[PDB]
């Protein structure tokens, strides 16, 4: 069944999910590239915890104690808390789930506190999973409350209506044309090995990752610079922001190619105007980044055209356009 996503800060992936046998609501970021889901505790003692939605283990009687300490030292900054078990509810779905009771975060500001998001809902894989636990999604076919282990993320192509995340079947009302599966090259994240072109620049068999947590398309650095050098573009000086005309011709289509079907992004799709309505000026959603080897990343703007679906049961990924 469906869940409603709203826009946060040009990352339209927040949704509601519930903990425990009463209504414990948390604004969730449904991450595709993170494994374990985590929540701000009532006993969270950190500065920003002030205004965010709290988990009270005690008022929900399903609390299966684990109470073992977890050290989630992420890429930005650090989240640490204590494992807890309880019912986790999306819509009609609720189940026995081992998650993180968070007491303390540090380096995730300035972005966390400003946003409405409360919690990170990991939708990833077991290897990424510390605690070596199967993911929510997998522990539902395991413990029958739905049939097949699959999720789909729908972001509307005019960035105005409601977005959805489904779990159950491919909901056909979403996509357009055939839907395309692709073959994962890791059991780590939802990544796949693709050829990807912009200018004359091309990086054959480069590993790519779908990421709903990230609000820009990412490209290795030297990929970037090679067209971009002459691709007259500008900056907020030594601070990662990049800019050109909204009326720009020179600009290539993000070509993301595979032995089945190519996924293209048009200039009109990875640019956002700045002077609000009737603006001359646009910011690419492309930031140069070497995460790793030949690693590109596809975040919101991508999902904002291509409807994506994610299949544990097939180690496959959904790709089609949107309604």
């Amino acid at each position: 069944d469906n869940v409603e996503l709203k826009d946060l800060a040009n990352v339209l992936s927040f949704g509601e999910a519930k903990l425990g046998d009463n209504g414990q609501k948390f604004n969730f970021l449904f991450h595709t590239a993170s494994s374990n889901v985590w929540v701000p505790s009532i006993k969270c003692t950190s500065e920003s915890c002030e205004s965010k939605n709290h988990y009270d283990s005690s008022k929900s009687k399903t609390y299966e104690k684990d109470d073992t300490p977890v050290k989630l030292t992420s890429k930005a900054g650090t989240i640490s808390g204590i494992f807890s078990k309880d019912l986790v509810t999306i819509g009609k779905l609720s189940v026995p789930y081992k998650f993180i009771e968070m007491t303390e975060i540090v380096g995730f500001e300035p972005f966390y506190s400003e946003s409405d998001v409360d919690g990170v809902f990991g939708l990833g894989w077991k290897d990424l999973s510390i605690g070596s636990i199967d993911p929510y999604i997998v522990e539902l076919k395991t413990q029958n409350k739905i049939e097949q282990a699959v999720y789909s993320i729908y972001l509307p192509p005019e960035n105005k209506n409601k977005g959805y995340l489904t779990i159950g079947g491919i909901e056909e009302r979403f996509f357009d044309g055939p839907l395309n599966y692709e073959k994962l090259n890791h059991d780590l994240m939802w990544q796949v090995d693709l050829d990807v072109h912009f200018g004359n620049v091309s990086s054959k068999k480069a590993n790519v990752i779908l990421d709903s947590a990230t609000s820009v398309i990412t490209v290795p650095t030297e990929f970037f610079n090679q067209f971009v050098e002459s691709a007259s573009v500008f900056k907020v000086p030594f601070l990662s922001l990049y800019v050109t005309t909204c009326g720009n011709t020179k600009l290539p289509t993000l070509e993301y190619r595979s032995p089945n079907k190519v996924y293209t992004l048009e200039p009109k799709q990875y640019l956002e105007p700045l002077e609000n309505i009737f603006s001359a000026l646009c910011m690419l959603n492309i930031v140069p980044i070497d995460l790793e080897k030949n690693t590109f990343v596809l975040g919101d703007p991508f999902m904002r055209k291509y409807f994506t679906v994610y299949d544990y049961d097939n180690h496959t990924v959904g790709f089609a356009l949107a309604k």
């Binding site: 800060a9 991450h31 609000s215 930031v287 790793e292």
Partner: peptide
């Protein structure tokens, strides 16, 4: 941006 893999 908000970049969240290393």
């Amino acid at each position: 941006x908000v970049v969240x893999a290393x």
